Design a protein around this ligand. Structure first.
Ligand SMILES: Cc1ncc(COP(=O)(O)O)c(CN[C@@](C)(CC(=O)O)C(=O)O)c1O
Ligand SMILES: Cc1ncc(COP(=O)(O)O)c(CN)c1O
Lengths: 414, 412
């Protein structure tokens, strides 16, 4: 019988993502000692997701409000959310805010913010529809950075030296050198704080050196701020770099995610903050951003944004939230401290100060792939081949086991 | 002086439909009426949150076991399945043969965008941006917007509305179908055509399908109104189901903005039908990569509401009734708007106003009349002559029918 083939007959099966497999194997591992350090979200000491008390509270107040409806939000999003989000990253006293040269676009998480910004830059930045401008990402960086910029059309994606495998810290010299040799107007994707996946960030003094080169070579700063407050527990400190760049007079984009700091992962709340030199540019830029949004998602969802704006606008809720965030930051700080302490007490060969120097949920342990392989196959400890672990996978109950296993992997495997 | 990197960014053109909304709200005239944006309104000119929706919201809020952990890239499984079932029917051979796939999307637009992105990468070759894409004449403006952004360089139109006959130009549509290169993509309105409100009858659908099948034309269905064309979900999905029974492979971008009235929660689904199950797995693998670099994973509130409604027989029943209520109000106004006018002796034979289905009715007003009605009487509508039947209420019904009557006469 005649039968032409499907129009999807030659569509290949996309390669699977390592981590998605990792999570499956772990789930099937029957060993009661198994540990998951490959998780990508906050977890309590008893390995449970955690909905912020303040969030549960706000949801109840929203549910009980009969005045709300489901009519479309503006293309750019909930006005109150956008204002509060930018104010959070920039500070109430930001000169950019006082000078009315800030704009905000509600987006689908930090990912959506990054996509809209890249789409904009690929059409109106450094000329019209210039897909040739080099885009620089850290080496290594969150896998989706390359993906978002490549999909936006950018053809020249480069990397700047960041992690130093030997020193187990920041390769400032290599980074500086890459900045120096970057063509004028090149775009640099910078992690505001809590670098993903290394956990290593420049110190404020090092940020000053970075800013100095970007300043004179007209390098564009595209900040990715996915962990404000959640990183160190202090909202202000976590946004220092962004604010420093504003004070130094840069124009910039800042992709904000509220997934981790509000634990709203699945409500996709993000905001793209734009900082321009003159107020008039903001209207023109936002008008073009409206066009991009329109053909992507049309207009943004309301639930998450409503929660965040209510929280950030009511002093009582805001103060409660800052406490909920410190709680998260504090647990992570504890796990780092406790882990370093055990490794040192075990007299584990090598330096381990990077474990407490690092900031945030993610950490580049410095273990090689054979040591990681050992930890998985032998000790039932799941992590990525890169040595990256999520501190949230550690608990007061599994800290002893993890530390001794690592000590083992470091002493028996080469 | 270091100039700004945004110095030369031009001022873009305002997204017209989202402009009228802003104009209305801030307009201070007391008799202002909004026949613009396509959203339901009660007979009191107020937004309507479906009773069934309010109930499900309450239950979600009272469920402490729910969390906010990321949903899978493709979306909430129960939603994807329920959504596809709604369009294809509980007894679709395609569902039984496990050759259906579903991708949760950011409303209807999001579903259209994802589908367009996939076609531009994997359909009719690799990275083939030359496959012609056809849209109706006229159509929802964002149709052209979405496909152009996906990279398609050849967007064409097919004859649809007959200005003089004020109906479907079946002969033109067929002729354009016949003259379209094989494998061209056709963007089809499942029902409640926007903005004409005019759809082919089942007999005409069969004719349209006959040519597509012969010429290997790809049907990309846009279903944003299942339930509004008639007030019955099953009847409104007939065309899609017929194509599926005829062995077509296709995409169907579903929106739940209107039928659930969840406009601001951005609930959509892209249903995919293939000849066999293995293709579904591969196609989905590719769509995950597309979604990943666009929104990463979808929001959950809206999808939770819809999956809950479609999975509970008691709630499904309540929802179908809430829909019929919306369609019935529309079915009502298509008459009182007509009556009124015939009475006001509005020069002409305005009958289409009641033969068209859905929330929109293509009247027959020139652009100058629109300007007159928006500026002098504050009746915000589209320049094309498209009016939202939902904007009408027994109250402003008189002020409206008169307003248009004054136009056609003095400004003709
Ligand atoms: C045919 C069609 N497809 C898709 C959509 C988008 O649905 P979404 O909101 O779920 O993404 C609409 C909405 N068109 C409206 C009702 C609103 C709009 O322009 O976006 C209209 O007024 O025509 C539509 O009419
Ligand atoms: C550096 C970085 N950037 C962006 C994101 C995207 O976050 P979202 O889930 O809000 O899209 C993440 C994940 N938190 C991240 O780690």
């Amino acid at each position: 019988g005649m039968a032409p083939p499907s129009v999807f007959a030659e569509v290949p099966q996309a390669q699977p993502v390592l981590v998605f497999k990792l999570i499956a194997d772990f789930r099937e591992d029957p060993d009661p000692r198994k540990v998951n350090l490959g998780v990508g979200a906050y977890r309590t000491d008893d390995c449970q997701p955690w909905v912020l008390p303040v969030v549960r509270k706000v949801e109840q107040r929203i549910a009980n409000n009969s005045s709300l409806n489901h009519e479309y939000l503006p293309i750019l999003g909930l006005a109150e959310f956008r204002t509060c989000a930018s104010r959070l990253a920039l500070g109430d006293d930001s000169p950019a805010l006082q000078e009315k040269r800030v704009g905000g676009v509600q987006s689908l998480g930090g990912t959506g913010a990054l996509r809209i910004g890249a789409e904009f830059l690929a059409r109106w930045y450094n000329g019209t529809n210039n897909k040739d401008t080099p885009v620089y990402v850290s080496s290594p960086t969150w896998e989706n950075h390359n993906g978002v910029f490549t999909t936006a059309g950018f053809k020249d994606i480069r990397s700047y030296r960041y992690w130093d495998t030997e020193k187990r810290g920041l390769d400032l010299q290599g980074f500086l050198s890459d900045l120096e040799n970057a063509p004028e107007f090149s775009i640099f994707v910078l992690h505001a704080c809590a670098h993903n996946p290394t956990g290593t960030d420049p110190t404020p003094e090092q940020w000053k050196q970075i800013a100095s080169v970007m300043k004179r070579r007209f390098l564009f700063p595209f900040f990715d701020s996915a962990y404000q407050g959640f990183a160190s527990g202090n909202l202000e400190k976590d946004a220092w770099a962004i604010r420093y760049f504003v004070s130094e007079g840069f124009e910039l984009f800042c992709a904000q995610s509220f997934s981790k700091n509000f634990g709203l992962y699945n409500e996709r709340v993000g905001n793209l903050t734009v900082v321009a030199k003159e107020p008039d540019s903001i209207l023109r830029v936002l008008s073009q951003m409206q066009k991009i949004v329109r053909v992507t998602w049309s207009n943004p969802p309301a639930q998450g944004a409503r929660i965040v704006a209510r929280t950030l606008s009511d002093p009582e809720l805001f103060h409660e939230w800052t406490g909920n965030v410190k709680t998260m930051a504090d647990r992570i700080l504890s796990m780092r401290s406790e882990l370093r302490a055990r490794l040192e007490a075990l007299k584990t060969p090598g330096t381990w100060n990077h474990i407490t120097d690092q900031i945030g949920m993610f950490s580049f342990t410095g273990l090689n792939p054979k040591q990681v392989e050992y930890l998985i196959n032998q000790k039932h400890i799941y992590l990525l081949p890169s040595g990256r672990i999520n501190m949230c996978g550690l608990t007061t109950k599994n800290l002893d086991y993890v530390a001794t296993s690592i000590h083992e992997a470091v002493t028996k495997i080469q």
